[PDB]
Amino acid sequence: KFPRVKNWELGSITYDTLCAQSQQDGPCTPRRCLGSLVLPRKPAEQLLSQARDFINQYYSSIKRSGSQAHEERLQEVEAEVASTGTYHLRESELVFGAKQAWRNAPRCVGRIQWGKLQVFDARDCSSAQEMFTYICNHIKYATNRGNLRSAITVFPQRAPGRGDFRIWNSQLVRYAGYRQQDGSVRGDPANVEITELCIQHGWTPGNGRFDVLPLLLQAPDEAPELFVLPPELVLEVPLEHPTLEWFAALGLRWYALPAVSNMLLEIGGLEFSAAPFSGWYMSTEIGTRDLCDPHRYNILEDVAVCMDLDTRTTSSLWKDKAAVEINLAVLHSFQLAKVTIVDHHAATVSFMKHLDNEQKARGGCPADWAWIVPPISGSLTPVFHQEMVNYILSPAFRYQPDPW
Amino acid sequence: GPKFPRVKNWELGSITYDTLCAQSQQDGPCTPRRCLGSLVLPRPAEQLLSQARDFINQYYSSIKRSGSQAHEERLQEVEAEVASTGTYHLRESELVFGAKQAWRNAPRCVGRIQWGKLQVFDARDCSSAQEMFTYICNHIKYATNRGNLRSAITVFPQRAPGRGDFRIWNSQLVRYAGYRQQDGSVRGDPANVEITELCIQHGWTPGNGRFDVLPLLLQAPDEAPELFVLPPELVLEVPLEHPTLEWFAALGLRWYALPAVSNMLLEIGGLEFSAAPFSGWYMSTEIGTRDLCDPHRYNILEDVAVCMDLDTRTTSSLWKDKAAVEINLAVLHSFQLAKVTIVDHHAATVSFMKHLDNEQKARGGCPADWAWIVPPISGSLTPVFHQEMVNYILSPAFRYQPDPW
Numbered sequence: 025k026f027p028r029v030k031n032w033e034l035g036s037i038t039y040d041t042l043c044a045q046s047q048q049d050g051p052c053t054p055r056r057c058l059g060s061l062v063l064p065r066k067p068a069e070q071l072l073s074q075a076r077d078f079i080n081q082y083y084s085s086i087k088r089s090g091s092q093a094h095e096e097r098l099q100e101v102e103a104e105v106a107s108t109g110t111y112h113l114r115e116s117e118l119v120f121g122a123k124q125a126w127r128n129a130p131r132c133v134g135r136i137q138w139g140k141l142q143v144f145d146a147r148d149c150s151s152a153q154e155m156f157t158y159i160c161n162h163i164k165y166a167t168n169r170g171n172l173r174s175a176i177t178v179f180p181q182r183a184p185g186r187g188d189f190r191i192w193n194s195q196l197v198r199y200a201g202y203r204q205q206d207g208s209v210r211g212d213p214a215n216v217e218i219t220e221l222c223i224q225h226g227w228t229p230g231n232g233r234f235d236v237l238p239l240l241l242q243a244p245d246e247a248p249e250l251f252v253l254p255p256e257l258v259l260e261v262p263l264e265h266p267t268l269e270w271f272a273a274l275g276l277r278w279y280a281l282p283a284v285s286n287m288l289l290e291i292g293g294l295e296f297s298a299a300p301f302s303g304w305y306m307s308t309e310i311g312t313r314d315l316c317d318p319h320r321y322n323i324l325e326d327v328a329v330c331m332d333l334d335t336r337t338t339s340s341l342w343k344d345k346a347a348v349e350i351n352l353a354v355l356h357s358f359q360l361a362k363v364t365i366v367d368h369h370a371a372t373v374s375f376m377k378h379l380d381n382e383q384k385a386r387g388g389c390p391a392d393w394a395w396i397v398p399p400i401s402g403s404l405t406p407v408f409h410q411e412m413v414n415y416i417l418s419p420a421f422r423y424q425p426d427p428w
Numbered sequence: 429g430p431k432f433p434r435v436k437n438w439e440l441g442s443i444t445y446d447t448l449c450a451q452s453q454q455d456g457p458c459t460p461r462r463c464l465g466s467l468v469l470p471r472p473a474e475q476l477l478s479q480a481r482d483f484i485n486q487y488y489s490s491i492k493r494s495g496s497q498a499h500e501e502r503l504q505e506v507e508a509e510v511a512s513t514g515t516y517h518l519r520e521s522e523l524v525f526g527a528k529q530a531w532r533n534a535p536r537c538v539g540r541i542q543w544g545k546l547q548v549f550d551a552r553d554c555s556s557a558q559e560m561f562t563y564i565c566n567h568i569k570y571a572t573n574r575g576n577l578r579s580a581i582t583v584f585p586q587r588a589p590g591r592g593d594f595r596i597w598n599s600q601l602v603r604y605a606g607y608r609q610q611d612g613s614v615r616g617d618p619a620n621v622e623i624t625e626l627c628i629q630h631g632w633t634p635g636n637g638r639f640d641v642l643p644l645l646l647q648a649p650d651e652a653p654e655l656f657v658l659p660p661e662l663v664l665e666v667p668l669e670h671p672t673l674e675w676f677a678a679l680g681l682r683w684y685a686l687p688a689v690s691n692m693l694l695e696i697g698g699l700e701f702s703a704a705p706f707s708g709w710y711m712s713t714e715i716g717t718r719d720l721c722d723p724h725r726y727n728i729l730e731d732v733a734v735c736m737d738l739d740t741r742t743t744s745s746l747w748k749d750k751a752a753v754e755i756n757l758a759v760l761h762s763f764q765l766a767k768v769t770i771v772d773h774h775a776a777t778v779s780f781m782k783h784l785d786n787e788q789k790a791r792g793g794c795p796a797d798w799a800w801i802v803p804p805i806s807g808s809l810t811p812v813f814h815q816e817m818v819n820y821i822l823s824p825a826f827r828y829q830p831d832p833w
């Protein structure tokens with residue numbers, strides 16, 4: 025009933041009791057595990073019991089569980105749902121909910137920071153114009169001249185009678201991908217489709233490898249609108265290498281701020297279709313995935329040739345050697361430019377501390393092993409040797425369909 | 429779409445559906461409420477006969493004689509044997525098919541492209557520990573083939589009703605001793621402290637090195653295990669050196685050629701083979717990353733980084749990643765120089781992708797444990813990282829079994 029969870033490096037055992045609080049089914053069954061899938065295929069009464077559960081979470085968090093303020097808030101929500109089929113969160117509850125969604129996020133290795141999150145309430149937004157202003161403030165706040173600060177901005181919730189507020193971009197800052205005649209891509213191949221949408225909605229495209237995309241913001245039931253981010257708001261870091269001088273000449277660069285803008289924040293049965301959030305990078309995201317993935321910037325071979333490695337055979341481990349230097353260039357360049365970054369060793373070590381904190385606090389912590397273990401040097405980090413239980417707790421970040 | 433798991437490769441954008449998981453007759457550890465996929469060990473004549481029938485059906489399908497007289501007659505023969513004895517026995521070619529199918533079905537093995545090429549040694553006539561030793565020595569000689577390694581398995585008699593099991597106490601046929609020191613530390617391989625201490629208790633005179641090959645503790649039914657030293661000339665080892673770092677040879681590191689698992693249960697059609705050691709060749713990351721660099725194993729990362737003169741006082745110099753790469757390169761280079769079969773993690777995972785494609789066409793899927801298939805260094809640099817995988821238990825299977833002590 026309660027899974028035994030072992031660390032194979034240290035020989036220590038815990039039992040996860042938190043997982044019994046999951047009310048939401050994942051993709052696995054006893055016949056087969058689908059834990060490696062990225063996206064698997066998945067009324068008053070239901071809303072009212074999610075609302076109640078969450079309000080119960082909130083009053084318990086402020087050690088006022090059972091008080092008058094608690095009973096009366098439950099009645100307000102009941103009264104509101106029974107009349108209108110929905111209800112609204114107080115700001116303090118929203119702040120609690122956002123932090124809890126982050127805490128509960130099984131694919132996030134940065135969760136030791138969960139208690140430290142700036143929550144901007146943007147639920148009084150009524151136009152794409154206003155959305156843009158809120159997004160510009162978020163970026164300015166979060167960026168903080170390189171001293172990055174975790175933030176979320178929460179736009180108006182989904183409503184039965186109408187379309188969603190949506191940010192069409194997957195991140196607030198992304199580079200364009202331009203499909204060429206010859207079928208190759210100039211820029212970031214992950215972004216070809218959003219780049220084409222921006223052009224279709226009136227953007228004058230660039231022609232570089234690192235052109236920052238405009239935002240396509242959508243107010244309910246209206247065509248999305250295009251807004252260019254003022255270049256001064258978008259902090260970027262040129263990549264150099266500590267010892268390899270030719271590396272700067274690659275002209276490589278990356279932006280400071282990872283800010284997810286296409287996920288749905290669910291709190292107490294309410295759904296927030298636009299709720300972009302940002303922290304700071306772990307270096308492997310840039311060094312290994314963004315720059316080295318074969319379907320991304322795919323620079324490995326170029327770096328290897330510059331390093332004069334033998335690219336003829338896999339057994340020279342030229343790929344591994346080049347990937348290491350690229351990750352080192354990322355860490356050094358962010359450190360030089362005084363922009364917050366964490367390496368995968370420091371990050372996984374802080375995650376292990378988080379696992380221990382959450383064991384004491386809640387009797388468990390949902391974690392997706394495949395996402396927590398970094399994409400290089402897996403077993404050289406302490407998380408490789410740690411068993412993990414994966415389940416869905418609410419409040420939660422979820423995937424949602426693309427608006428187009 | 430189709431009512432089967434949809435499986436995506438995120439590098440290539442291609443999709444498949446796994447229909448093979450429909451054949452699974454055994455539950456894994458996951459439920460809709462929680463995924464337990466990362467757990468290393470997840471926790472009568474009626475049951476036997478249905479398992480036997482199933483296996484015999486698998487056999488007759490594979491030789492394209494499904495529904496035939498010979499098929500119906502073998503079915504009849506199996507249930508009559510079970511009806512009078514409680515068990516039955518496999519024909520020789522049924523054992524061959526079953527052993528290969530068990531390797532084919534193993535979700536955690538990246539080497540499965542080779543599955544059809546497995547020498548099956550039938551040792552079901554073995555009746556003593558002395559004879560097990562002879563059989564094991566012959567397996568080692570054949571499998572090692574002076575460096576040109578060959579996949580093999582040796583199968584000892586099956587579990588019987590109210591008779592003891594054949595067991596090899598060692599987890600592998602070749603392992604290094606781990607000696608617990610007075611300071612609490614371990615000289616040798618810390619993974620092998622317990623088996624080393626069992627060998628000593630059973631009369632082995634222990635060495636005092638970092639790479640002492642362990643003796644075999646072999647158990648015939650209802651007898652105490654008996655101790656057997658492998659004659660050194662049979663155990664091929666590879667001294668470790670680096671292609672450009674000249675001091676690496678001075679570390680005195682080495683590893684053995686033959687990875688041979690000896691504590692797993694081979695299950696075929698309800699029958700349980702408690703002693704059935706099998707061997708392949710190494711993937712280089714097994715040695716260079718896990719055996720040598722695991723903090724709870726030889727733990728040599730720091731030593732090697734100091735020699736390379738790296739900054740070991742901070743994580744952001746990536747000293748661990750740099751040392752690990754050179755240790756891995758040294759492993760590959762030394763095996764190559766010594767002419768001993770080895771495969772790097774890039775060639776292995778590329779061949780595994782080919783195997784997934786083969787099995788898609790042959791069987792409509794392939795059970796795979798993502799966390800085990802993706803190598804422990806350079807994960808996303810290999811094609812399997814971007815491949816979604818479905819994990820399920822098919823039979824015939826290799827299973828874990830409790831330690832005999």
Ligand code: HEM
Nearest residue numbers: 126129131132133134137174175301302303304305306421
């Ligand atoms: C403070 C710095 C943070 C670091 C270093 C960090 C680290 C990471 C990493 C490495 C991933 C996997 C990224 C990928 O491979 O796509 C991730 C995922 C995720 N993080 Fe964080 N995180 C941070 C802050 C945050 C914040 C502030 C939130 C929200 C309030 C958050 C919520 C999430 C969610 C929902 C995912 C899963 C995204 C997906 O499924 O695509 N994290 N985190």
Ligand code: HEM
Nearest residue numbers: 531534536537538539542579580706707708709710711826
């Ligand atoms: C031919 C060369 C082979 C290669 C390169 C190879 C590769 C591997 C690797 C790297 C692992 C994971 C090892 C670990 O991290 O503990 C593994 C596991 C496994 N392989 Fe292979 N393999 C080969 C041959 C074989 C053979 C001949 C068999 C049996 C007939 C086999 C069956 C298994 C099984 C049952 C496991 C799971 C062990 C466990 O759960 O602890 N493989 N293989």
Ligand SMILES: Cc1cc(N)nc(CCc2cc(N)cc(CCc3cc(C)cc(N)n3)c2)c1
Nearest residue numbers: 062194195282283284285301302303304305306
């Ligand atoms: C469209 C899409 C869907 C899906 N399931 N997975 C991806 C993978 C790529 C990716 C997508 C997003 N939206 C955000 C990140 C950064 C993740 C991140 C977030 C934060 C807050 C900090 C940090 N260091 N990294 C990476 C894309």
Ligand SMILES: Cc1cc(N)nc(CCc2cc(N)cc(CCc3cc(C)cc(N)n3)c2)c1
Nearest residue numbers: 599600687688689690706707708709710711828
């Ligand atoms: C602590 C622990 C307990 C337990 N029961 N199982 C494990 C898994 C680790 C492992 C255990 C054994 N016995 C053999 C290998 C070599 C795997 C191998 C086999 C073959 C045949 C070829 C190859 N390249 N590698 C790996 C760990």
Ligand SMILES: C[C@H](O)[C@H](O)[C@H]1CNc2nc(N)[nH]c(=O)c2N1
Nearest residue numbers: 060061062394395813814815816
């Ligand atoms: C198929 C596989 O599950 C997929 O490639 C996952 C693996 N682990 C990951 N881990 C992180 N952090 N981010 C990812 O995008 C992925 N991709």
Ligand SMILES: C[C@H](O)[C@H](O)[C@H]1CNc2nc(N)[nH]c(=O)c2N1
Nearest residue numbers: 408409410411466467468799800
């Ligand atoms: C906790 C985790 O399940 C455990 O460390 C696994 C991860 N993947 C592995 N993969 C392989 N091939 N071998 C292993 O021993 C492990 N260990």
Ligand SMILES: [Zn+2]
Nearest residue numbers: 052057458463
């Ligand atoms: Zn699962």
